[PDB]
Design a protein around this ligand. Structure first.
Ligand SMILES: COc1ccc([C@@H](C)c2cc(-c3sc(C)nc3C)[nH]n2)cc1
Ligand code: NA
Ligand code: NA
Length: 219
């Protein structure tokens, strides 16, 4: 029967306008703040994401954890012609919702949705999806996977100097292992973007970690 994710999608299809990504974002944010709570990056963090995308104008973006497609719509709407978003989603029903969301938004040709676990899919990017290196990675999937997937991206050769990692929810509920690693490592140049979760009345944040290249062996 009915699910919250189906309801989000229906609300968008009813109230937003096809081919208009901004209206889709606004409908989702309206739904999640007025009608029914849902895992959602939200407009405040959304504006931080927008600014990062505009600053670095990435040609190839990897998103981990699409859910209903809010972040995919958010980022893909700002991508240049020929730029690509690859988004990974472990739940088949959510992957389907994300595809319909993007189709409605008119962004389906900018996005490839991969249905599976990050640690299974990431090592296939070079062979199967013609990836050299990624320009940007958005992490918003299972929080205990931020660190191991970041380490995996590095060893698979998917990061280059200047690749931007942007990670959500690093304070609430928190990813302290990930923060300790990237802030402490000379391979990552880190900045923190605080943002309030009003519905929870606690400050959260996004971490931006810019890959510097691998660590040098001792001489
Ligand atoms: C309980 O916290 C959460 C957080 C996020 C999600 C959704 C957004 C999600 C997570 C994923 C994963 S997990 C994994 C090993 N690879 C992927 C691609 N896809 N989609 C669900 C529950
Ligand atoms: Na999130
Ligand atoms: Na660092």
């Amino acid at each position: 029967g009915d699910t919250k994710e189906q309801r989000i999608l229906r609300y968008v299809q009813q109230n937003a306008k096809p081919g208009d990504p901004q209206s889709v974002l606004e409908a989702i944010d309206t739904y999640c703040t007025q009608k029914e709570w849902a895992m959602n990056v939200g407009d405040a963090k959304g504006q931080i994401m927008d600014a990062v995308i505009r600053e670095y104008s990435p040609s190839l973006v990897l998103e981990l954890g699409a859910y209903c497609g809010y972040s995919a719509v958010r980022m893909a709407r700002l991508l240049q012609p020929g730029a690509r978003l690859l988004t990974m989603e472990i739940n088949p029903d959510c992957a389907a919702i994300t595809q319909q969301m993007l189709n409605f938004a008119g962004l389906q040709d900018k996005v490839t949705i991969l249905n599976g676990a990050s640690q299974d899919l990431i090592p296939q990017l070079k062979k199967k999806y013609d990836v050299d290196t990624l320009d940007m990675v958005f992490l918003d999937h299972w929080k205990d996977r931020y660190l191991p997937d970041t380490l995996l991206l590095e060893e698979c050769g998917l990061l280059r100097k200047g690749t931007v990692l942007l990670a959500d929810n690093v304070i609430v509920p928190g990813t302290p292992d990930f923060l300790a690693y990237v802030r402490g490592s000379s391979s990552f140049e880190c900045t923190h973007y605080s943002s309030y979760l009003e519905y929870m009345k606690v400050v959260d944040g996004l971490e931006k970690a810019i890959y510097q290249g691998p660590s040098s062996p001792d001489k």
